[PDB]
Amino acid sequence: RQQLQVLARYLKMDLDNGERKFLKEKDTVAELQAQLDYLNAELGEFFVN
Amino acid sequence: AKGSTLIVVPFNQGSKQDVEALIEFIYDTEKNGGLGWDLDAIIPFAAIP
């Protein structure tokens, strides 16, 4: 693991970049799902469908 | 007047969630965070031009 981290540092490779983007996108999913849940609580399942 | 109480609440009559929440707040007991009131009159004069 230490050798891999050294090589990643040399290569300027961000091993955590994909994970960071994934958590940002998961937060975006949560916020869009919150909006959809609000619209569903508001109009109802029948209306939205 | 003596005995009169004014309860100013934020409210969107265009959202059924607020409609239900306001009626629940009016009718819930004071212990449960409500008013413990039973409405004698309803005057729904809210509108938008």
Biggest alpha carbon–alpha carbon distance for chain B: 39
Q: How was this structure determined?
A: cryo-EM
Given a contact cutoff of 8 angstroms between Cβ atoms, the answer to whether A36 and A42 are in contact is no
Contacts of B3 (CB under 8 A, 6+ apart): none
B49, two tokens: 């031009």
By the CB < 8 Å criterion, does A45 face chain B? no
Task: Give percent helix, percent strand, percent coil of chain A, each to the nearest 5.
Answer: 85, 0, 15
Which one, of B15, B5, B6, B7, lies nearest residue B46 by Cα?
B15
- For A40, which residue in chain B has the nearest alpha carbon? B17
A33, two tokens: 């799902």
Neighbouring CB atoms inside 10 A of B11's CB total 13
Q: Which amino acid is at B24?
A: E
User: Which of B12, B13, B16, B20 to mutate against chain A (most A CBs within 10 Å)?
Assistant: B16
Given a contact cutoff of 8 angstroms between Cβ atoms, the answer to whether B13 and B44 are in contact is yes
Query: To which residue do tokens 């009559």 refer?
Result: B13
Q: What 8-state DSSP symbol labels residue A12?
A: T
